[PDB]
Amino acid sequence: EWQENKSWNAHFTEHKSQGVVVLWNENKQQGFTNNLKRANQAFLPASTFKIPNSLIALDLGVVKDEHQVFKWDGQTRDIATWNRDHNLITAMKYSVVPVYQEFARQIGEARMSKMLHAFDYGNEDISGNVDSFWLDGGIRISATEQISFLRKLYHNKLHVSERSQRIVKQAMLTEANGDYIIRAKTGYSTRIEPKIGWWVGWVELDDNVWFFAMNMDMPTSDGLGLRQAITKEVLKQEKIIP
Amino acid sequence: EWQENKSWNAHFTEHKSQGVVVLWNENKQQGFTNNLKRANQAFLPASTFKIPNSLIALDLGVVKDEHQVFKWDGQTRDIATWNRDHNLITAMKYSVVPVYQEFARQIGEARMSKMLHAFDYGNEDISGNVDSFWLDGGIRISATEQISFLRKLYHNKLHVSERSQRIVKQAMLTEANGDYIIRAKTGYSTRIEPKIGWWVGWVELDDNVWFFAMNMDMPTSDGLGLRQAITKEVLKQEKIIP
Numbered sequence: 001e002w003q004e005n006k007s008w009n010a011h012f013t014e015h016k017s018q019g020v021v022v023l024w025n026e027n028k029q030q031g032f033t034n035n036l037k038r039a040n041q042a043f044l045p046a047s048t049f050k051i052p053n054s055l056i057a058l059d060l061g062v063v064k065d066e067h068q069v070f071k072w073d074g075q076t077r078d079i080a081t082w083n084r085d086h087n088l089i090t091a092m093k094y095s096v097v098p099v100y101q102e103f104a105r106q107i108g109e110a111r112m113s114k115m116l117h118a119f120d121y122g123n124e125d126i127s128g129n130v131d132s133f134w135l136d137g138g139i140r141i142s143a144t145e146q147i148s149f150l151r152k153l154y155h156n157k158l159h160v161s162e163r164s165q166r167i168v169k170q171a172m173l174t175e176a177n178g179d180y181i182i183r184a185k186t187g188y189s190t191r192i193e194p195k196i197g198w199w200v201g202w203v204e205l206d207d208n209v210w211f212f213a214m215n216m217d218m219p220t221s222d223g224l225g226l227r228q229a230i231t232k233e234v235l236k237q238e239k240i241i242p
Numbered sequence: 243e244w245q246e247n248k249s250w251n252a253h254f255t256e257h258k259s260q261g262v263v264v265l266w267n268e269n270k271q272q273g274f275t276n277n278l279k280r281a282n283q284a285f286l287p288a289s290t291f292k293i294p295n296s297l298i299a300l301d302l303g304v305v306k307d308e309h310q311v312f313k314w315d316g317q318t319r320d321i322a323t324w325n326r327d328h329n330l331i332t333a334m335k336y337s338v339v340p341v342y343q344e345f346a347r348q349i350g351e352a353r354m355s356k357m358l359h360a361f362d363y364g365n366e367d368i369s370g371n372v373d374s375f376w377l378d379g380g381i382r383i384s385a386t387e388q389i390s391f392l393r394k395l396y397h398n399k400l401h402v403s404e405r406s407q408r409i410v411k412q413a414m415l416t417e418a419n420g421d422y423i424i425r426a427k428t429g430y431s432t433r434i435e436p437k438i439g440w441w442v443g444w445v446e447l448d449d450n451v452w453f454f455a456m457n458m459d460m461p462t463s464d465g466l467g468l469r470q471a472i473t474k475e476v477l478k479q480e481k482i483i484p
């Protein structure tokens with residue numbers, strides 16, 4: 001029973017941007033967004049695909065656990081954080097695309113396809129390079145679809161092991177304190193227009209959970225930090241966090 | 243393997259306090275403390291016993307998962323956060339003694355004893371009431387023994403399921419940001435002298451884990467906040483956290 005809140009567009013305009021924030025009050029089974037149409041527009045997921053990709057790689061044993069080390073391949077890349085060994089925890093934290101490309105190759109085109117259909121993940125289309133389709137292939141997901149997928153991950157309802165889902169939700173840990181916990185993943189789609197930034201995840205309160213998915217136009221990397229700052233202004237506006 | 247660092251006494255002195263901080267560098271397999279004698283003095287665990295108690299209740303199915311609700315028994319207590327319903331996450335957060343006392347009665351004397359022996363938890367002596375021996379019974383544990391127990395929990399090496407251990411480590415989440423994660427549990431032992439405060443757990447970094455166990459004299463409730471404050475001053479001093 002979705003509800004539209006145009007007040008929120010203020011946060012996008014003040015930041016010289018356009019985008020959508022979608023929230024879901026789990027207790028009340030009630031959704032809210034600034035833009036019902038853009039909430040259902042599907043885009044490339046970019047690094048937010050590291051959630052289902054990690055889930056699949058764990059459940060198939062391509063990743064043994066959150067401690068297994070995947071060493072640098074020696075090629076210097078532009079993001080310096082990528083030029084070191086990683087585990088699942090730090091691979092996610094620094095969005096190490098190459099580590100997840102290796103996972104995608106080992107998972108294989110056919111297993112990737114079956115699992116994403118099992119998840120009902122976006123348009124379930126992995127057309128393109130096995131190792132790049134979430135950046136420049138056929139897969140597409142909307143903010144509302146992000147929420148639906150996230151709600152199943154949260155409740156361990158996806159068709160992978162419970163252990164797989166616990167580990168990935170651990171790896172998503174972004175922020176925690178005495179008022180709330182945030183489990184989430186950023187994304188930045190640049191290879192295919194329109195270039196957009198994503199932030200999807202949820203906020204755990206003592207007595208409720210609030211899922212969120214936001215994307216926003218992002219022509220230049222200068223505004224990447226607005227992904228989180230706008231979402232948090234909306235969460236503050238709505239009294240979800242202090 | 244266990245070095246003394248007396249410069250940390252400055253943090254206790256400046257807070258008109260007395261106690262010990264024990265740190266363990268997991269990568270280097272080396273410990274550090276301001277007071278070797280007090281680091282091996284064993285005390286009642288008070289609410290730090292909620293870690294082993296939770297693990298045992300989970301593995302035995304007394305607790306089904308972190309979402310199962312334990313309803314307030316209607317008895318108003320002086321700590322207002324206890325006079326509501328709780329799950330495992332929030333019973334840990336608010337140290338809700340009565341929920342854990344009910345866990346312990348359902349675990350029972352014999353199961354509690356045998357499984358604490360399996361954990362090599364302190365002196366393994368549950369003498370007293372099954373539902374309060376960790377507040378005023380015979381169980382004693384030192385800071386270096388907290389460390390040993392915590393390290394097993396971290397590595398999933400205790401003799402309970404990986405899932406029980408993952409759940410309890412999730413319930414231990416205290417603080418997280420882009421620099422570190424802290425999983426820990428406070429405790430406050432008042433029923434038998436000497437009255438003391440505890441804080442035990444660890445700091446996850448990208449590339450290392452630092453375990454910590456501290457206890458401090460606590461003649462009045464007014465210095466409770468110094469359990470965390472003094473520990474964080476040592477971590478700052480050692481450049482484990484900024």
Ligand SMILES: [Cl-]
Nearest residue numbers: 170173412415
């Ligand atoms: Cl966690």
